Structure formats: C-alpha cells, structure tokens
C-alpha cells in the first residue's frame, strides 16, 4: 500500500509527577488498541483520574489534553496493589475509546474522543519539532521525576518505620533521621536530581539501626 491512516502523535495518560506515559506511539496504523495496567502511588487511594493526552513531550503539561475522567470506589489498599487496566482503542474512523477498569472491584469508566479532536497538521509538525529541540531537557525531566517519585516513597517508608520502631530507636538516631528526612523533603521540591540522591544517601547513612529493625 502507498498510503494508510495513522494516528499522528503519541497518545497516553498523565502519570505521577506530571509525566506523559505513552500507550499508542506516533504514526501507529489505525485501527489499533493497546492496554497497560497502572497502580496507585500511595496507600489508601480510592479515586484516580485518567487524563488523556496527545503529543510528544515528556511533561504532561506541554501536550494536548483530549479529555479526562475519574474512576472511583477502589478499595483503599497499599501503594502498588490496585491493578487498574487502561485500554486505548482507536477505530477505523479515528474515534478514540479510552477505558479504565479496576480488577479487584470491577469498577470501570470510559470516554469517547472524536476523530477531529487534538492538534491539526501545523500544530503536529510544530509538536514534533519542539520535542526534538527539547529532547535532552525532556529526558532530564523524566529522570528527575523518577528520582522524585523514589525519594517521595523513601520519605514515607522511613516515617512509617520511625513510628513503628518507637522506643526501640535510640534518641540520637531518631534525631539524625528526622533531620535527614527534612533535608530530603526540601531537595525533592527542587529540580536537581543529584541533590535529591545525595539527600537519600545521607538519610540511609543515619538509618542503619532503624533498618536493623
């Protein structure tokens, strides 16, 4: 064949930290479908939002929003336990169907996005040029977000351990840990990955007794 229909930009959803995660790649032939299971980042999250995006940039905020919906009623469970399957399906007429279904509860929600939605030819070209001009920056953004999300987890899991060690943790250890958590919490708000990693390292160095238990 010498011509065919494709979807002209990547399609996906916003994930933790403001990132666009791709479910269908740019220039994929239509019709097409793809699913991916996602979970929750923190304990006891019972409601989630699926924000649908078109584009090639790593910051969700720089892509074209196509719509959104929420999924409610998920049993409050530990971080990473919910299994929420997200399915993008584009039919032969360019209509995009997005669904999310929580496997434990069977709760489901969906949206239909019409084929004329999203960016036009000129904005499509501009998007691809902008993503190429910002490729290094977007890579660095994705690496910062991966570090931030790790560091966020380390703060939470450390505070939980401090709480449950209680008395068994010497005062001087708890003082050192408390001060390292503060520093890490500060570094996470900035945009220097190595500063965050350095603060994780300083926290591990004062945490050894806390992980003896």
């Amino acid at each position: 064949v010498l011509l065919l229909d494709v979807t002209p930009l990547s399609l996906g959803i916003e994930t933790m930290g403001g990132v666009m995660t791709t479910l269908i790649a740019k220039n994929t032939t239509i019709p097409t479908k793809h699913s991916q299971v996602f979970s929750t980042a923190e304990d006891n999250q019972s409601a989630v939002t699926i924000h649908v995006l078109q584009g090639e940039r790593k910051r969700a905020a720089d892509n074209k929003s196509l719509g959104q919906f929420n999924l409610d009623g998920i049993n409050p469970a530990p971080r990473g336990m919910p299994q929420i399957e997200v399915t993008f399906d584009i039919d032969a007429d360019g209509i995009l169907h997005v669904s999310a279904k929580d496997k434990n509860s069977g709760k489901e929600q969906k949206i239909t996005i019409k084929a004329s939605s999203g960016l036009n030819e000129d904005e499509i070209q501009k998007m691809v040029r902008d993503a190429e001009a910002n490729a290094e920056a977007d890579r660095k953004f994705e690496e910062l977000v991966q570090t931030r999300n790790q560091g966020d987890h380390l703060l939470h899991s450390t505070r939980k351990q401090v709480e449950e060690a209680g008395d068994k943790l010497p005062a001087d250890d708890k003082t050192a840990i408390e001060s390292a958590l503060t520093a890490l919490e500060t570094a996470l708000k900035g945009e220097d990955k190595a500063a965050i990693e350095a603060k994780m390292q300083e926290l591990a160095q004062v945490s050894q007794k806390l992980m003896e238990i």
Binding site: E14, T15, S39, T40, Q45
Partner: peptide, 8 residues
C-alpha cells in the same frame, strides 16, 4: 513504573 497521580 506505571503509577497514577496522587490525590489532588
């Protein structure tokens, strides 16, 4: 990793 945003 495939995690949704935290609650608003």
């Amino acid at each position: 990793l495939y995690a949704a945003p935290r609650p608003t």
